[PDB]
Amino acid sequence: YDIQAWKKQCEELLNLIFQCEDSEPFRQPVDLLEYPDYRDIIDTPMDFATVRETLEAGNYESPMELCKDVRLIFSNSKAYTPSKRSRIYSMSLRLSAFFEEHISSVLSDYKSALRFHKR
Numbered sequence: 001y002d003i004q005a006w007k008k009q010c011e012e013l014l015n016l017i018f019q020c021e022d023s024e025p026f027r028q029p030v031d032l033l034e035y036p037d038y039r040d041i042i043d044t045p046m047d048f049a050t051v052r053e054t055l056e057a058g059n060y061e062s063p064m065e066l067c068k069d070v071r072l073i074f075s076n077s078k079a080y081t082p083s084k085r086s087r088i089y090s091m092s093l094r095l096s097a098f099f100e101e102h103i104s105s106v107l108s109d110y111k112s113a114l115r116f117h118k119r
């Protein structure tokens with residue numbers, strides 16, 4: 001029932017994501033010089049270094065907020081991809097499955113801790 005435990009759990013999950021080869025296209029903001037039409041398609045860029053920095057700055061109040069930004073990295077990849085068979089999009093799908101498999105317990109534990117606090 002530790003209400004703060006999600007933060008280190010998210011830090012550790014981001015460390016695993018950064019070690020995953022599938023995260024490399026998503027570690028830093030998409031290069032606008034390499035993809036000059038990116039901002040014509042994508043309204044809100046997001047990347048894992050921005051997520052980690054937001055977490056480390058104490059600018060997430062809950063793991064749900066972190067999860068919304070990570071999901072935005074994946075929806076941006078799906079929206080920008082020219083093909084559902086593209087290399088970078090395929091990497092995003094695998095990374096998303098890995099993230100969802102690991103974030104589930106973080107969210108469950110946090111929500112349970114909050115319910116216990118308000119019991």
Ligand SMILES: Cc1cccc(C(=O)O)c1N
Pocket residue numbers: 025030035076077078080081082086087088089
């Ligand atoms: C950022 C991004 C997401 C999804 C697909 C691509 C691609 O160039 O195929 C891409 N550059």
